[PDB]
């Protein structure tokens, strides 16, 4: 599991994209239920700026 890191702008276009919908806007930008994310590569594949990357 990763984070939506600071590369993220609040663009929205990954929330619904996660097969397990393990995403929402959280701290400031998008966020991941990292518990519940499995390292599937989707989201990371979709994000215009590849922000699904870790804390
Ligand atoms: S890597 Fe896959 S399971 Fe994890 S948040 Fe992204 S889309 Fe969802
Ligand atoms: S697609 Fe990328 S930039 Fe858009 S909300 Fe998701 S992580 Fe942030």
Curated annotation (Swiss-Prot):
Its cofactor is [4Fe-4S] cluster. Keywords: 4Fe-4S, Electron transport, Iron, Iron-sulfur, Metal-binding, Repeat, Transport. InterPro entries: 4Fe4S_Fe-S-bd, 4Fe4S_Fe_S_CS, 7Fe_ferredoxin, PSI_iron-sulfur_center. Pfam families: Fer4_7. Gene3D superfamilies: 3.30.70.20. Binds 2 [4Fe-4S] clusters. [4Fe-4S] cluster 1 binds at residues 8, 11, 14, 47. GO terms for molecular function: 4 iron, 4 sulfur cluster binding; electron transfer activity; metal ion binding. Coiled coil: none annotated. Transmembrane segments: none annotated. It comes from the Bacteria. Ferredoxins are iron-sulfur proteins that transfer electrons in a wide variety of metabolic reactions. This is Ferredoxin. It comes from Clostridium pasteurianum.
């Amino acid at each position: 599991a990763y984070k939506i890191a600071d590369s993220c702008v609040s663009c929205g276009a990954c929330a619904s994209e996660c097969p397990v919908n393990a995403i929402s806007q959280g701290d400031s930008i998008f966020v991941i239920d990292a518990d519940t994310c499995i390292d599937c590569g989707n989201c990371a594949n979709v994000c215009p700026v590849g922000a699904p990357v870790q804390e």
